[PDB]
Design a protein around this ligand. Structure first.
Ligand code: HEM
Ligand code: HEM
Ligand code: HEM
Ligand code: HEM
Ligand code: ME7
Ligand code: ME7
Ligand code: CU
Ligand code: CU
Ligand code: CU
Ligand code: CU
Ligand code: CU
Ligand code: CU
Ligand code: CU
Ligand code: CU
Ligand code: ZN
Ligand code: ZN
Ligand code: ZN
Ligand code: ZN
Ligand code: ZN
Lengths: 106, 106, 106, 106
């Protein structure tokens, strides 16, 4: 999907996680966020529409997505361990990464 | 791109790295390998054409890709620090991941 | 060194990074922070004086340190690439991990 | 503990894992390996007895330990998830990191 699409999936599922009861729900939202962050990898954000896929800026843009994926990766391990609250907190702590990218590139 | 496609890109660029001279070329192959692993995320491998995108087998399939992406992520940092040999050895060490997935799922 | 000791080193060096000018200084503080987090691993926090080194509470306690070590690991790659600001900021985003552990275990 | 000590703990527990019948056992060996790897962080290997802690060689030495720790971290999530065989295989694939460091620095 497109960039703004993937972002919505990220945002919608964050909320699903905030409010979830049980591990199953959390696993699911995380799985969708994971796919969304992976698909987002290829994108070019408007603010650097011109630049080439080699700018220190594209390389730094894409870096924030490795961080995100690493973190979704780990949050999900917690969910598989039935550590519902610990996973929910890992999800809350992702926002730091979301915000970090947004302040630079959005 | 398709899954066999992405696998070719992975395998072609591993050779490019094996034989490369200087930092710049290594960076490039890894970058291409990164994109390929990210796209490969959403894929369903023939051996699991039946199971839904939730079976412990799909979750495990995709797990192997987080491992690889993390490892490509790190080799590329090495390439940026002008440590070329270190980066090729990280590249060679990846294979341990390639092989691991292949003998479960290929 | 002791737990509170290591925490001081973590906190002191965070500030050193906040205010640093150039790559070299950032590398140093992170290096010191790395060693402090690694040494912190074996520690038992007062609040879990009650639990053996196998409680889902010690394992979770130690988990927070893997997160931090990974994050120090990555900040430092940034510093080696001379990306001073990018590093300083990775450093800022760490606090999310500090805070997360403190809220649970301090 | 000392460096050769930590290496024994790593090697002994690798075996314990290769042998191990049930998940509880695997968790234990990995936990011991993680502690060992963390404590090994601060060590200076004979081959680099002279060099200051700031040589690209000490930096690279310690780097191999972050890799190791990252992989022990992950293998343990597999164990908590009751996936015994997958954890065993993550453990075997660690050897790649052991060997990599030994060929350079042992
Ligand atoms: C992390 C979990 C995360 C969230 C959540 C998130 C949300 C988000 C929203 C809701 C938008 C759009 C606002 C709107 O459409 O009105 C948005 C947009 C962008 N994001 Fe984002 N985002 C998260 C993560 C990240 C990360 C990690 C990056 C970079 C590494 C990133 C980047 C962007 C960009 C660029 C946009 C705007 C694109 C556009 O509008 O054309 N996001 N995000
Ligand atoms: C790691 C860098 C990596 C490489 C290299 C690689 C190569 C590769 C090749 C050459 C094929 C060829 C198929 C053919 O000739 O018919 C192939 C196919 C598959 N792969 Fe792969 N692969 C690497 C990594 C990984 C990882 C990390 C996974 C699992 C997450 C994985 C899986 C698969 C699967 C399944 C196939 C079968 C697809 C098919 O033949 O239709 N690979 N790969
Ligand atoms: C992250 C880099 C980080 C910082 C910074 C930090 C700071 C810190 C302070 C300032 C104290 C109080 C000491 C004093 O007043 O003299 C403190 C104490 C504890 N910490 Fe911490 N800490 C950081 C990281 C982490 C992480 C990642 C964890 C757990 C996984 C953690 C835990 C604790 C605990 C527990 C204490 C109190 C225990 C005690 O012996 O009093 N910290 N930290
Ligand atoms: C990975 C899990 C791993 C294992 C296993 C391992 C084992 C090991 C043994 C058995 C020895 C020999 C001990 C002796 O000299 O009596 C040994 C020695 C060294 N190792 Fe090791 N080691 C593993 C991992 C790693 C890693 C990741 C590094 C470096 C980053 C590393 C280093 C060393 C070094 C140096 C030695 C020699 C020290 C000495 O002989 O005094 N090991 N290891
Ligand atoms: C790899 C080694 C190197 O020196 N360079 C250029 C120098 N440089 C840094 O050391 C940090 C940013 C930078 O440009 C490399 O690219
Ligand atoms: C997954 C979460 C949960 O609690 N259970 C039951 C017990 N169990 C584990 O927690 C890990 C392996 C195991 O059987 C789950 O299966
Ligand atoms: Cu898309
Ligand atoms: Cu769309
Ligand atoms: Cu759209
Ligand atoms: Cu749309
Ligand atoms: Cu020791
Ligand atoms: Cu001893
Ligand atoms: Cu001894
Ligand atoms: Cu001894
Ligand atoms: Zn974890
Ligand atoms: Zn690294
Ligand atoms: Zn990085
Ligand atoms: Zn022994
Ligand atoms: Zn994992």
């Amino acid at each position: 999907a497109d960039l703004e699409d993937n972002m919505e999936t990220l945002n919608d599922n964050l909320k699903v996680i905030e409010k979830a009861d049980n591990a199953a729900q959390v696993k699911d939202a995380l799985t969708k966020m994971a796919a969304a962050a992976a698909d987002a990898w290829s994108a070019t954000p408007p603010k650097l529409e011109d630049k080439s896929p080699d700018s220190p800026e594209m390389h730094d843009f894409r870096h924030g997505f490795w961080i995100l994926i690493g973190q979704i990766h780990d949050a999900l391990h917690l969910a598989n361990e039935c550590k519902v609250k610990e996973a929910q907190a890992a999800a809350e702590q992702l926002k730091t990464t979301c915000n970090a990218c947004h302040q630079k590139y959005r």
